[PDB]
Amino acid sequence: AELDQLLQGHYIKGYPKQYTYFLEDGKVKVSRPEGVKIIPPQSDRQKIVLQAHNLAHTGREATLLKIANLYWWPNMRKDVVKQLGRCQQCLITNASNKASGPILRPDRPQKPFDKFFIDYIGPLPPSQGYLYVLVVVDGMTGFTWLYPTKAPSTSATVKSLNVLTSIAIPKVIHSDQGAAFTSSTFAEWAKERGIHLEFSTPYHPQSSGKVERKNSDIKRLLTKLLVGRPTKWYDLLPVVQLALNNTYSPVLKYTPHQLLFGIDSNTPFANQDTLDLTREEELSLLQEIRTSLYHPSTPPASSRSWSPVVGQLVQERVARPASLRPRWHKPSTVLKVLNPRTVVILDHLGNNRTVSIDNLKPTSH
Amino acid sequence: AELDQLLQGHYIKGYPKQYTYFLEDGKVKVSRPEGVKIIPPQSDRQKIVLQAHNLAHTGREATLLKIANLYWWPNMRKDVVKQLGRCQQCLITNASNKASGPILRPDRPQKPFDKFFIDYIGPLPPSQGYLYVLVVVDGMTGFTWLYPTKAPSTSATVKSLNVLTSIAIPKVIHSDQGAAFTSSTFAEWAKERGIHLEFSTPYHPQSSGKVERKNSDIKRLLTKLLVGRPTKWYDLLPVVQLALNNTYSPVLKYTPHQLLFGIDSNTPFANQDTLDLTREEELSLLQEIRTSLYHPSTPPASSRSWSPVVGQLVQERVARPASLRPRWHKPSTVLKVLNPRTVVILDHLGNNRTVSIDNLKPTSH
Amino acid sequence: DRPQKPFDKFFIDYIGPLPPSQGYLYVLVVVDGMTGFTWLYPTKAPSTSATVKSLNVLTSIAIPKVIHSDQGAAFTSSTFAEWAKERGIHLEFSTPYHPQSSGKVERKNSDIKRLLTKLLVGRPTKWYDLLPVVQLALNNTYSPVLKYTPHQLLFGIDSNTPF
Amino acid sequence: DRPQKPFDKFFIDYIGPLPPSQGYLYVLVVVDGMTGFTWLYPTKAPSTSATVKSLNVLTSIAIPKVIHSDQGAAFTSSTFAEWAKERGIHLEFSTPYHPQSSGKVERKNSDIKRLLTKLLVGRPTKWYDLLPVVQLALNNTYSPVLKYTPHQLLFGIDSNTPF
DNA sequence: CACGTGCTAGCACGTG
DNA sequence: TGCGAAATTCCATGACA
DNA sequence: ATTGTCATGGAATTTCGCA
DNA sequence: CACGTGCTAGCACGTG
DNA sequence: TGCGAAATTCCATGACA
DNA sequence: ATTGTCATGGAATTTCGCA
Ligand SMILES: [Mg+2]
Ligand SMILES: [Mg+2]
Ligand SMILES: [Mg+2]
Ligand SMILES: [Mg+2]
Ligand SMILES: [Zn+2]
Ligand SMILES: [Zn+2]
């Protein structure tokens, strides 16, 4: 009873005066629309709000309502949110109700061999002793090379890519942080040929979207071609590769082969418009196609999204949570905002993690 | 060369006259904006469209474009879609681009014990030798009973529910087609007490939404309470049950306990508004609450959804497809339309399946 | 003062020993003072130990303000006193030898005793399994004084198994 | 008639035997007639058998209209005739003993032969591993007659490894 | 050898 | 031109994960 | 230190054949 | 014992 | 009434699965 | 023969204390 001046008819900021505050049982009470409620001294409030919340680690409203049953004081929700921001278990176990910011649509690599995207499809049902496919997709064209491997290992990746680079050498190769790609042996191999390695953020396959999306197309065709037949895919990759490389993208009106070369080879339903032009007049037209390719814009932001700001408190989706374990790490801080969707955080362990915002939620309160 | 009258300047319906149709190589050709194209006799067309499509089992446009390179004829896409509707592999492997119709929001069970929803949470990390939780949620109130079991078996379900029915007996018990629930032994048990068994459609946990959603709430609290402690959940179910049953639903402004009884028991932050009323005046107010509970309406349909119509061709999502195997069954027919979201189909094996439309796609063409 | 309500007082006592029904010798009678609602828990002894096992289940559903009982061992122990206080349940005791409740509870406790004894000699040493029915029966019985059933009074709605 | 283009004609021949480079005795030279672009496949024999292994890889990338070759065993066999026809590749043969190509191909086939022989005695019995470089080198070489590189002509863009 | 990162398996129940 | 049919383009949905 | 994608097929819409 | 239905595990790589 | 602050309600997002 | 759900916390909005 520190602010008890109310009992003697004094005014205290925040406390409505049209109500009457009396004393019974040894408690300061209030006559209210809801009923008669109890007003605890400021000191006892933190404790009460805690007790109520801890009953079921309830969010804002559910916590307030519990307290409403016995008590009233000014701005209870302000005292309530204070606690919710302080409950370690709620902060690290609750879901977020804020969507990621709208997706970036990176510029299509300018020329063939500006960027490779690589990934492994597998494991698959054994064929000729093989279990995986290394899928190399060129970013500009979409052209795709498929290599069967017995394992998703640096060993095999190097083995495959040496064959591929006989043709040409890429500026950049993008990949997910799959062991075989984040090896030192591979960084070596890349360095020796002067290729920059660029890696997707972890647990975020959208980044390698190009390959992943090409994977679908590879699986879809494989499947169709293996209907009602044992799944022996090895002998088919060669066919799927040629097929898919020579298949028109409706929005672009072009085939990866075309975008790579400007003319069809001796594949069936071969195009032959540029048949009367010289190779020189043909190769120029290509440059013109490659520049005026359709490109999507970023879709409109969700009504209830968020974008990361430096110094913001932000938590990382736990990689692979055990059963009955919390799905979010202890709160961290935004250091760099590499773009509206990528972030460098102070990792909980505690390093610099470059993470996608998809694996982030803004910390509440 | 059946419709070759064009070569002699005759008109044939569908063939533009402003163009000139000549003969070279032994083929009927046409001078076109695109270039010079070849017009095959009607008989050769089915074959060509097939050959092109089969290259990569391409959809409409991608197939057309391939053919465009060499040929032109009237309404090629009409001949193209004809084939796509006839390619078994494409029909059963391709994804759909049509969303389900908007969800139904079933009426909340009128009274307590009109409906039970049941499900098993688990397996969990062993506690006192227990591995599963049987979760019984009453549809009207949300009141929930939790039973620890060593297995998700009829045996254990019966064992648990006998204890539960000591209190009261439900009209209906809803569940998923989990073995323990679709047993004969359980149908027996249910029959003996005059409870109707109602089952969710297969591979569709939304149907048991009430339980499933309560599961989340159960796991979330369990987790919070087990932070930084070994996962021994057994001794906690009792606490989680009381906690959760006594926790306000913000939209309803009521706790499952309240909705069940009308007054709080001796739990902390006990409500006491209806303290001055008689039990009779208290129990009437309850009836009034139970009728005027907030209820959501069905959300607006997606721009590109569909609703099932009797006699429609429709395919069922393959339960658990092996790797590189098609994700859809051979096309079937709608028999009954139980509601805008539930369907009885002629099962591919071939029975009457009551399936959710979520596990259905409308057959293309 | 303020009208009788559910969970205001739970009346408990033990009944037994009985014929060893699948290993269970006793029964813990719990009766809500105002609805007359009855819970029946078969136990192996009139011990604090098993009074707790059973009343844990019950208090995981709803929790009385007060427990009223006789001065039987199981009820006057420390453990049970400590168990009651952990949950803020006040313990009230009838003076020894002169037992007391309200009108309603006394009658219900009679019914249970007889309804138990009848479906004990008619259906002999197999009473365990039948307890759930006795319970439904009891709770679906019509109250002479009040125009309603214990089920009706507690849940506020017609039972789906009337008796 | 209609201007020379890529994939219009692929010129093939074998080169060997050479020192056993990690088990590989021969090399299949494939050269695009118009870009001069060159593919190099190490083989263990100038057999139809391995001409197929290698040209399968290549024809999984792009497919020539015509293959031009000498009347070597590997090229005049049935199997190879049947392999060519399966894919609609026309086989064209130089008259025996009097070899022929175009100007461009003849020169490129010379370069390969010498560029191969030099980085054969300078870097001795370990040529296998170096084939990928020879290939890049060859394809990044400047054409005297045409103002462009084989890479440039084929892909239509500056190579990221100029030579 | 546990750890981080990429992937797809697997086991339990009741029933024929 | 203007009108009806045909062609072409729009696009949200889903699967890679 | 990095970032989603594109085949697909009904529906919307623009182009075309012919006056 | 394979099958349908409900659930969550698991193994492979390179690196410390 | 009218205005500023406080309270209460709106709701889309995600997790059960 | 059956059918999604609701806790959640910033943002939108309605109610309240006081003139
Ligand atoms: Mg992948
Ligand atoms: Mg479940
Ligand atoms: Mg006694
Ligand atoms: Mg030779
Ligand atoms: Zn909390
Ligand atoms: Zn097809």
Side-chain angles (χ1 to χ4, degrees), chain A residues 1-12 14-33 35-77 79-81 83-329 331-365, chain B residues 1-12 14-33 35-77 79-81 83-329 331-365, chain C residues 1 3-52 54-81 83-97 99-112 114-146 148-163, chain D residues 1 3-52 54-81 83-97 99-112 114-146 148-163:
Chain A
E2 99 276 2
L3 298 166
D4 73 284
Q5 292 96 326
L6 301 109
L7 281 154
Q8 280 143 338
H10 287 287
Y11 179 74
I12 296 164
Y15 289 80
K17 236 290 180 196
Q18 58 187 56
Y19 292 117
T20 36
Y21 310 98
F22 49 86
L23 156 54
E24 272 172 351
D25 298 39
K27 310 157 196 279
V28 195
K29 300 198 176 206
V30 59
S31 196
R32 290 205 64 90
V36 187
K37 309 303 181 178
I38 305 162
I39 312 166
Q42 191 89 59
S43 55
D44 282 343
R45 297 184 181 173
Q46 192 199 354
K47 195 181 183 188
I48 286 164
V49 179
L50 204 62
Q51 274 185 231
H53 163 81
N54 272 357
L55 275 176
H57 283 277
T58 52
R60 203 214 304 121
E61 291 302 303
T63 304
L64 176 104
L65 305 186
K66 263 283 152 201
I67 307 152
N69 300 337
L70 309 169
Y71 306 96
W72 179 97
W73 69 77
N75 321 285
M76 285 163 74
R77 283 170 176 82
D79 281 318
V80 162
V81 293
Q83 288 317 315
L84 303 169
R86 292 186 195 274
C87 180
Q88 202 65 15
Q89 303 97 307
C90 278
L91 290 187
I92 74 167
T93 326
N94 289 358
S96 165
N97 55 7
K98 319 272 182 267
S100 289
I103 49 161
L104 298 165
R105 308 304 297 283
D107 316 76
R108 176 177 296 263
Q110 252 187 288
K111 311 166 225 67
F113 309 104
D114 288 358
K115 222 181 278 211
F116 281 179
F117 289 89
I118 70 176
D119 189 38
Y120 278 111
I121 291 182
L124 295 178
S127 186
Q128 326 286 302
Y130 289 49
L131 291 181
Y132 294 84
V133 180
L134 180 74
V135 180
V136 182
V137 190
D138 166 71
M140 189 288 153
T141 54
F143 208 86
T144 299
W145 285 263
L146 303 171
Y147 303 98
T149 87
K150 294 168 200 272
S153 65
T154 312
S155 167
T157 323
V158 174
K159 262 150 191 171
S160 309
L161 286 176
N162 284 353
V163 181
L164 177 49
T165 65
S166 313
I167 324 280
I169 291 255
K171 285 181 181 71
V172 201
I173 294 170
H174 184 109
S175 102
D176 45 64
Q177 299 187 26
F181 303 137
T182 51
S183 94
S184 72
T185 339
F186 189 65
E188 283 289 70
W189 180 87
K191 191 168 195 158
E192 297 185 55
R193 288 146 179 85
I195 316 153
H196 181 239
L197 293 194
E198 152 177 288
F199 298 119
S200 329
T201 31
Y203 314 106
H204 197 255
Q206 290 90 304
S207 310
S208 328
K210 274 212 136 80
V211 221
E212 295 302 7
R213 178 61 178 82
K214 186 68 56 174
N215 293 338
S216 164
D217 262 290
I218 298 153
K219 287 190 165 166
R220 188 152 64 91
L221 182 67
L222 271 173
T223 302
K224 297 178 189 194
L225 295 171
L226 293 181
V227 162
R229 191 183 334 264
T231 46
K232 269 223 155 147
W233 49 271
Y234 184 90
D235 278 359
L236 281 189
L237 291 171
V239 194
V240 170
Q241 174 180 294
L242 188 72
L244 269 163
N245 276 330
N246 279 292
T247 274
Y248 286 98
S249 166
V251 286
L252 303 191
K253 335 289 315 302
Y254 290 93
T255 84
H257 186 267
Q258 291 164 346
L259 298 175
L260 187 58
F261 299 102
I263 20 76
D264 286 357
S265 49
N266 201 22
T267 41
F269 290 79
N271 190 286
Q272 47 176 356
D273 309 321
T274 61
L275 213 60
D276 277 324
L277 322 207
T278 82
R279 182 51 168 162
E280 310 220 338
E281 297 152 353
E282 199 175 71
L283 287 166
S284 78
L285 189 84
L286 179 50
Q287 325 286 17
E288 195 68 340
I289 290 155
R290 294 165 152 169
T291 48
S292 59
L293 285 179
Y294 161 87
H295 184 76
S297 66
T298 106
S302 155
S303 340
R304 298 262 199 83
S305 54
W306 70 284
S307 261
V309 183
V310 187
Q312 185 162 41
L313 280 153
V314 158
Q315 311 174 233
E316 191 184 19
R317 154 98 47 191
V318 169
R320 283 164 64 251
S323 188
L324 291 181
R325 290 296 181 205
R327 291 180 308 274
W328 298 92
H329 284 291
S332 298
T333 335
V334 184
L335 307 175
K336 260 264 184 89
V337 169
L338 308 185
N339 51 58
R341 279 193 57 76
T342 330
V343 156
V344 181
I345 61 136
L346 188 59
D347 174 75
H348 74 97
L349 214 68
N351 309 57
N352 296 71
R353 279 262 269 184
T354 325
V355 296
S356 170
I357 63 157
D358 285 343
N359 305 320
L360 294 176
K361 68 171 206 142
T363 300
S364 301
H365 343 298
Chain B
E2 99 276 2
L3 298 166
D4 73 284
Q5 292 96 326
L6 301 109
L7 281 154
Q8 280 143 338
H10 287 287
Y11 179 74
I12 296 164
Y15 289 80
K17 236 290 180 196
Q18 58 187 56
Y19 292 117
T20 36
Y21 310 98
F22 49 86
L23 156 54
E24 272 172 351
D25 298 39
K27 310 157 196 279
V28 195
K29 300 198 176 206
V30 59
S31 196
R32 290 205 64 90
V36 187
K37 309 303 181 178
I38 305 162
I39 312 166
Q42 191 89 59
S43 55
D44 282 343
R45 297 184 181 173
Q46 192 199 354
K47 195 181 183 188
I48 286 164
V49 179
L50 204 62
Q51 274 185 231
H53 163 81
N54 272 357
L55 275 176
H57 283 277
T58 52
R60 203 214 304 121
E61 291 302 303
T63 304
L64 176 104
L65 305 186
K66 263 283 152 201
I67 307 152
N69 300 337
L70 309 169
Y71 306 96
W72 179 97
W73 69 77
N75 321 285
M76 285 163 74
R77 283 170 176 82
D79 281 318
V80 162
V81 293
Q83 288 317 315
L84 303 169
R86 292 186 195 274
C87 180
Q88 202 65 15
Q89 303 97 307
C90 278
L91 290 187
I92 74 167
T93 326
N94 289 358
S96 165
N97 55 7
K98 319 272 182 267
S100 289
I103 49 161
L104 298 165
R105 308 304 297 283
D107 316 76
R108 176 177 296 263
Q110 252 187 288
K111 311 166 225 67
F113 309 104
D114 288 358
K115 222 181 278 211
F116 281 179
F117 289 89
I118 70 176
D119 189 38
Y120 278 111
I121 291 182
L124 295 178
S127 186
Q128 326 286 302
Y130 289 49
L131 291 181
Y132 294 84
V133 180
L134 180 74
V135 180
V136 182
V137 190
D138 166 71
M140 189 288 153
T141 54
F143 208 86
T144 299
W145 285 263
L146 303 171
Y147 303 98
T149 87
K150 294 168 200 272
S153 65
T154 312
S155 167
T157 323
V158 174
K159 262 150 191 171
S160 309
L161 286 176
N162 284 353
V163 181
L164 177 49
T165 65
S166 313
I167 324 280
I169 291 255
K171 285 181 181 71
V172 201
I173 294 170
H174 184 109
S175 102
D176 45 64
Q177 299 187 26
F181 303 137
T182 51
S183 94
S184 72
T185 339
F186 189 65
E188 283 289 70
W189 180 87
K191 191 168 195 158
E192 297 185 55
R193 288 146 179 85
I195 316 153
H196 181 239
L197 293 194
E198 152 177 288
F199 298 119
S200 329
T201 31
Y203 314 106
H204 197 255
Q206 290 90 304
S207 310
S208 328
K210 274 212 136 80
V211 221
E212 295 302 7
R213 178 61 178 82
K214 186 68 56 174
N215 293 338
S216 164
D217 262 290
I218 298 153
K219 287 190 165 166
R220 188 152 64 91
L221 182 67
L222 271 173
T223 302
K224 297 178 189 194
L225 295 171
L226 293 181
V227 162
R229 191 183 334 264
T231 46
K232 269 223 155 147
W233 49 271
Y234 184 90
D235 278 359
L236 281 189
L237 291 171
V239 194
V240 170
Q241 174 180 294
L242 188 72
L244 269 163
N245 276 330
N246 279 292
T247 274
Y248 286 98
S249 166
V251 286
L252 303 191
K253 335 289 315 302
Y254 290 93
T255 84
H257 186 267
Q258 291 164 346
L259 298 175
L260 187 58
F261 299 102
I263 20 76
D264 286 357
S265 49
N266 201 22
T267 41
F269 290 79
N271 190 286
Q272 47 176 356
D273 309 321
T274 61
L275 213 60
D276 277 324
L277 322 207
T278 82
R279 182 51 168 162
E280 310 220 338
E281 297 152 353
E282 199 175 71
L283 287 166
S284 78
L285 189 84
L286 179 50
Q287 325 286 17
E288 195 68 340
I289 290 155
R290 294 165 152 169
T291 48
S292 59
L293 285 179
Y294 161 87
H295 184 76
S297 66
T298 106
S302 155
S303 340
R304 298 262 199 83
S305 54
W306 70 284
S307 261
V309 183
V310 187
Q312 185 162 41
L313 280 153
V314 158
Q315 311 174 233
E316 191 184 19
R317 154 98 47 191
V318 169
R320 283 164 64 251
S323 188
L324 291 181
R325 290 296 181 205
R327 291 180 308 274
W328 298 92
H329 284 291
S332 298
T333 335
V334 184
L335 307 175
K336 260 264 184 89
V337 169
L338 308 185
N339 51 58
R341 279 193 57 76
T342 330
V343 156
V344 181
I345 61 136
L346 188 59
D347 174 75
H348 74 97
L349 214 68
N351 309 57
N352 296 71
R353 279 262 269 184
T354 325
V355 296
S356 170
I357 63 157
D358 285 343
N359 305 320
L360 294 176
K361 68 171 206 142
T363 300
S364 301
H365 343 298
Chain C
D1 181 72
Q4 270 275 71
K5 293 282 182 58
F7 320 116
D8 271 7
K9 194 167 280 142
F10 277 13
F11 293 84
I12 75 172
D13 198 348
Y14 267 103
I15 283 176
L18 306 188
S21 194
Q22 288 167 60
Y24 289 80
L25 286 153
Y26 292 89
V27 155
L28 179 77
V29 163
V30 187
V31 177
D32 176 39
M34 175 287 161
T35 59
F37 205 102
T38 294
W39 287 275
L40 293 162
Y41 300 86
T43 78
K44 290 180 169 195
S47 68
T48 295
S49 191
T51 316
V52 171
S54 294
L55 280 180
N56 273 350
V57 192
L58 182 62
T59 48
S60 83
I61 324 265
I63 292 172
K65 286 184 186 191
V66 187
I67 291 177
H68 184 116
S69 77
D70 41 307
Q71 305 224 353
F75 312 145
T76 46
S77 63
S78 291
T79 313
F80 191 73
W83 175 95
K85 189 179 180 185
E86 254 157 31
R87 294 151 179 81
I89 300 164
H90 184 276
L91 292 192
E92 194 141 290
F93 295 99
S94 71
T95 99
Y97 302 115
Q100 191 159 345
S101 334
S102 60
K104 184 159 179 60
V105 182
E106 280 172 345
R107 289 187 273 285
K108 206 82 201 287
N109 268 290
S110 191
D111 289 344
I112 299 158
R114 261 183 279 101
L115 180 35
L116 193 28
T117 52
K118 86 189 196 179
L119 288 159
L120 144 78
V121 77
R123 308 214 262 279
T125 182
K126 306 272 96 188
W127 56 270
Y128 182 85
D129 292 311
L130 296 140
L131 268 160
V133 195
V134 188
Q135 196 159 330
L136 283 151
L138 288 156
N139 292 308
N140 291 300
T141 275
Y142 168 56
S143 151
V145 177
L146 296 107
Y148 304 99
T149 68
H151 187 112
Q152 281 180 302
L153 287 156
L154 183 63
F155 297 119
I157 42 98
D158 287 335
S159 157
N160 297 295
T161 45
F163 256 93
Chain D
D1 181 72
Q4 270 275 71
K5 293 282 182 58
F7 320 116
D8 271 7
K9 194 167 280 142
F10 277 13
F11 293 84
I12 75 172
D13 198 348
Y14 267 103
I15 283 176
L18 306 188
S21 194
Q22 288 167 60
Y24 289 80
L25 286 153
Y26 292 89
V27 155
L28 179 77
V29 163
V30 187
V31 177
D32 176 39
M34 175 287 161
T35 59
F37 205 102
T38 294
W39 287 275
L40 293 162
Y41 300 86
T43 78
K44 290 180 169 195
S47 68
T48 295
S49 191
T51 316
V52 171
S54 294
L55 280 180
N56 273 350
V57 192
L58 182 62
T59 48
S60 83
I61 324 265
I63 292 172
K65 286 184 186 191
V66 187
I67 291 177
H68 184 116
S69 77
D70 41 307
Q71 305 224 353
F75 312 145
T76 46
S77 63
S78 291
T79 313
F80 191 73
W83 175 95
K85 189 179 180 185
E86 254 157 31
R87 294 151 179 81
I89 300 164
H90 184 276
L91 292 192
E92 194 141 290
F93 295 99
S94 71
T95 99
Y97 302 115
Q100 191 159 345
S101 334
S102 60
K104 184 159 179 60
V105 182
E106 280 172 345
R107 289 187 273 285
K108 206 82 201 287
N109 268 290
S110 191
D111 289 344
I112 299 158
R114 261 183 279 101
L115 180 35
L116 193 28
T117 52
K118 86 189 196 179
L119 288 159
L120 144 78
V121 77
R123 308 214 262 279
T125 182
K126 306 272 96 188
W127 56 270
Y128 182 85
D129 292 311
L130 296 140
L131 268 160
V133 195
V134 188
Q135 196 159 330
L136 283 151
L138 288 156
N139 292 308
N140 291 300
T141 275
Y142 168 56
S143 151
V145 177
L146 296 107
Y148 304 99
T149 68
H151 187 112
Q152 281 180 302
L153 287 156
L154 183 63
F155 297 119
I157 42 98
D158 287 335
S159 157
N160 297 295
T161 45
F163 256 93

